[PDB]
Amino acid sequence: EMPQAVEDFSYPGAAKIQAETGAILKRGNGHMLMTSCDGSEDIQVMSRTGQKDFCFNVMAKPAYLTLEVPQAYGIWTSADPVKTTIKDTDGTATVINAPANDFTGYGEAGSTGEPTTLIELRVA
Amino acid sequence: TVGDPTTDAKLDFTARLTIGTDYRSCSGALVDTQWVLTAASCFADDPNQPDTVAAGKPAQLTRATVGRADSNIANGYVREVVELVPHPERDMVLARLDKAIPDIAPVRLASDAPTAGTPLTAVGFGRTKDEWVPIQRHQGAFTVTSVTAGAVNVTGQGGDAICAGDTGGPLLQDKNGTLHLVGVNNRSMQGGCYGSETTSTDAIAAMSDADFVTQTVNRDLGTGNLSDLVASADFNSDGRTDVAAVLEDGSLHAFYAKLEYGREMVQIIGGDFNSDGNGDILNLYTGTATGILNKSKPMWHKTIKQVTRFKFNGRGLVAQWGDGNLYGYYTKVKMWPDATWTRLTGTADINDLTAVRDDGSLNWYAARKLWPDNTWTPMKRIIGGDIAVGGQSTLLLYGIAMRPA
């Protein structure tokens, strides 16, 4: 029996990504895609888990995707400001505003040394 | 729907709708400037069981953009949905907008189903083979595999499956530049989609329903403030006398007896005057097979008070003159020995010419009392064997409300 052709804003293929890269994805506005890192870099996320890293591509602005990546430590930006929400081990969340065309870190490689988790990645 | 992007003004009657902030999204198309047709499942808590999608306001704020083929530009119109009218049997709903979009034409509806082998096209804002959400809408190509009870089964031709976000999207079949809506996409195998894989390209769509739309879009033509210009005749060759009435738009609308509403001067009188099989409406407007009146012509080569229909020798009019006399016309005859005419009405097969006295009494001429009480004083333009506009200008049949409320 066929499924309804209705858009629920659940990231397509998220089940396979969890199996292959170790990252998990949930809901977004559909304008951010997970892709490979091969000269097509836009927003890059580095962590010490899963397959080490992965890249995302922005299709339109504004855009967001509430992906989850444990033990993240660094982010690269390009041609755009990036608003990143991370969470500590005590459940407290904070927001870091990263500048365009630069590199910033998170807790683990930041000011606190905490093994924080990426909760939300938002495009200006 | 996986195919070439299109922004041409052939499919600018399409629409994209969203419910809530990020709750649900699906496609649709215009059937009027005020009405957009989509699937009922888009508004369901469970899209696989669109039974609880009741008529009335949307559960969540629902908005739609029309004609915006390219999402990166401001081109197109944005309207809010105020009311929903679900189909009583199948997965289909009509959305009423707060405001009209008079600039964008609707798509015509098909008169019948496509058959197996028929080349159909489809357009929508759903997922592609490589994008979760597209920038521009895309057009695909499908063929009919079979037709079922109120639905059409289709398959992708050379791939191009119906995917996700295509629900509510139109199925189209064109001929000689004219596009007709043949159905609305509901479910699919979703093969060849971004983020997923399956071989099958099969999909199912609800069959287009012209009557459902007609009785919803035009649901409120009457019941409001109508003129007294009402007349009866058979305008659909059904064997049942229908009713036509003039509305505030200055046009004459036909309401068909089962009154259901159709699609398309001091006194008005109808009847099949020339025995042509199509009811007509001093100039005679002749009826045609399509229910549309032709250009009128003079019935002759100003002191008459009332004129109503009357059948003479199987075929006619009766005119009440200011002198109190009543004459029938085919050649004319005297209807009554003296000047004793009273409100003149049309005829009906009571067993006969109906009439109303100034004292409110109703009677008929072969007069004899036709109604136990005397409450017909305020009644005007009584038409025909069942037989008044009423004090609220709502036609009653003798007094049942033939008109909806």
Numbering used by the authors:
A (entry chain H): 42 to 165
B (entry chain I): 30 to 287, 292 to 297, 307 to 323, 332 to 351, 356 to 369, 371 to 385, 395 to 405, 408 to 417, ...
Could you share sentences copied from the article?
Here we show that in addition to small-molecule antibiotics, Streptomyces produce and secrete antibacterial protein complexes that feature a large, degenerate repeat-containing polymorphic toxin protein. A cryo-electron microscopy structure of these particles reveals an extended stalk topped by a ringed crown comprising the toxin repeats scaffolding five lectin-tipped spokes, which led us to name them umbrella particles. Streptomyces coelicolor encodes three umbrella particles with distinct toxin and lectin composition. Each contains an amino-terminal twin arginine translocation (TAT) signal, two sets of four ALF repeats (ALF1–ALF8), two extended coiled-coil domains, and variable C-terminal and toxin domains.
